Design a protein around this nucleic acid. Sequence first.
DNA 1: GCGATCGC
DNA 2: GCGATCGC
Length: 66
Amino acid sequence: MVKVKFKYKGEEKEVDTSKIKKVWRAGKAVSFTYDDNGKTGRGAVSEKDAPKELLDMLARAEREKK
DNA sequence: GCGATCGC
DNA sequence: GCGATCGC
């Protein structure tokens, strides 16, 4: 249970990896949707600032069909 | 502006 | 099927 830290509209936010729904790479933005206690949203961080657990989630998603 | 993607 | 997010 690691927390992903990201900036959204200037604010500092955090979401546990277990709340992440979908992860993808848009350019160098590791992007993701999540549902945090009813709050559905989207976040993104640079690949260079993403925690290993998020990158591993990303690799698992890149392995599957589109 | 572009990338990938979903809310609405 | 745009508008919207971030990183670049």
